[PDB]
Amino acid sequence: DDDDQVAFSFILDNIVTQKMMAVPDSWPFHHPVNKKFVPDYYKVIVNPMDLETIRKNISKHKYQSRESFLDDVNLILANSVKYNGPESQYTKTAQEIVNVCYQTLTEYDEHLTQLEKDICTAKEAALE
């Protein structure tokens, strides 16, 4: 019952590594953008986001529900749109990363909703 968070985060990590990181040519979004290859990236993108640091956030148990998890996932696509443009080949790839994530989230919807409530009802019964 305290593994409710450990289970939720384990599922989130596998979604990232087994489904999102499996999108064809998604390798530029696997890791923080190398400043050596695009120098001005951190001068135009103020909230940079990638899959590797989503996984580091998962390992720190930052996401207690899929809402905050999706906030950082959608941030990858928002940053590609702001940097690469809406019609970019990179942006279309990031859109498919976001697509396969929403896909497998509704795939596990009934299961995750259980974990999400058991995590939060434990959060409130612990501070109460």
Ligand SMILES: COc1cc(C(=O)NC2CCN(C)CC2)ccc1Nc1ccc2c(n1)N1CCCC[C@@H]1C(=O)N2C
């Ligand atoms: C070849 O490319 C890269 C290589 C490497 C690299 O470490 N490779 C070397 C490793 C050592 N080895 C000895 C030699 C190879 C890193 C980044 C590249 N490019 C890239 C990454 C991410 C984005 C990106 N590019 N782009 C492209 C346009 C800017 C924005 C857009 C974008 O959103 N994103 C997230």
